[PDB]
């Protein structure tokens, strides 16, 4: 099971500067040496590289776009099969009620429990309605990952109104909640942990130097 | 000449997770895409990789330890010759009063002006008196890099007492001053720029995921 604490997301999609299974493995090493309790990573190849540098538990996804669907985080059983091959400890997937390319969400959850019975699952949700559905489905972890990153949550960011969205998720489910998406400072990490999340995912504020650089430059441009 | 704005330091010494000319070149590309106006980098191999990736001006150093000297930033003519070969726009060196392994500081400044007449020089100092000495020696830039990192500045850190050390350096010299060392947050960057530095170096807060991770974990351990 994931410990309480900091999960570092070590992702770099094609055309991002640090795109490389190799490079993400050394980023995960840095996160381990700095006190992370877990890693979140994208694609079987990055997961397998990370598993050669660190023994931290990994939350795996596969970001892959499909025609005629906006679902791109572990959309179908093809992505699930890649993640079962990766041997990541937690399989995360979009758990929105958006139209998927192939299996429905219920079917994908059933598929994972059948084919990978020793692997925990994490729901990436955008609304309280989705979070409560994920708890019904027996997800091990419910994350706020897609809040602000769907067409129906545009402009909403996790930290808005003193993390009201997170407070609403925590009140709505008894499952382990993960604060993920727009946790960008140590002060925000402390806030979400104080509100009672199991653990938090921090990505860009540690592993996207372009994103961090933009925050430094922007302070001079306000 | 260096512009005003943000210089991102892209360093990873041999024991660090990201040690790699290729990775530091991608850190530098990320910094460029985020709005940096220059790069600081360590070793000829890293600098050459960076300069083939981005056209930003580079402040070059060579960190190399020598017996019976506490000087390790561009300590001798060996390191200067490596930086001349690198074609970096600005050669930075320890500009402390500490005895060097080979050539004195004054010796190395004259050596750079005669062997690389088109290259600007940056003084990494620890004290106001070293800042004044570097102005005497005709440095183009004077940085606060070693303030708090010498045996005669122990316990001192740039940000202490609302950046009083920086205010004292700016009052003491007419040359372009660079805020470098312990510029940890966008708020610190804004403060030093508002106090009148030419530009500021930010390294580990952008390009050392281990140190950023450590800052997230620490907030929970206070
Ligand atoms: Cl990046
Ligand atoms: Cl690091």
Numbering used by the authors:
A (entry chain AAA), B (entry chain BBB): 1 to 222
Sentences from the paper on this structure:
The third step in the sialic acid catabolic pathway is mediated by the enzyme N-acetylmannosamine-6-phosphate 2-epimerase (NanE), which catalyzes an inversion of stereochemistry at the C2 position of N-acetylmannosamine-6-phosphate (ManNAc-6P), yielding N-acetylglucosamine-6-phosphate (GlcNAc-6P). The crystal structure of NanE from Staphylococcus aureus, which comprises a triosephosphate isomerase barrel fold with an unusual dimeric architecture, was solved with both natural and modified substrates. NanE is essential for the growth of S. aureus in media containing N-acetylneuraminic acid as the sole carbon source and has a highly conserved active site across both Gram-positive and Gram-negative bacteria. Based on our structural and kinetic data, we propose that NanE performs its epimerization reaction using a novel proton displacement mechanism mediated by the substrate.
As Glu180 forms a short hydrogen bond with the C5 hydroxyl of the substrate, we generated SaNanE-Glu180Ala and tested the effect of this substitution on activity. We found that SaNanE-Glu180Ala retained ∼0.05% activity, but the KM was similar to that of the wildtype enzyme, suggesting that Glu180 plays a role in the catalytic mechanism. The single-residue substitution made no change to the overall structure or the conserved active-site residues. The salt bridge between Arg40 and Asp124 was preserved to stabilize the enolate, and the KM was similar to wildtype SaNanE, indicating that the short bond to the C5 hydroxyl makes only a minor contribution to substrate binding. This suggests that the reduction in kcat is due to the loss of Glu180 in the reaction mechanism rather than a compromise in substrate binding. The residual activity of the enzyme may result from an active-site water molecule that acts in place of Glu180 during catalysis, a phenomenon we have seen before in another unrelated TIM-barrel enzyme, dihydrodipicolinate synthase.
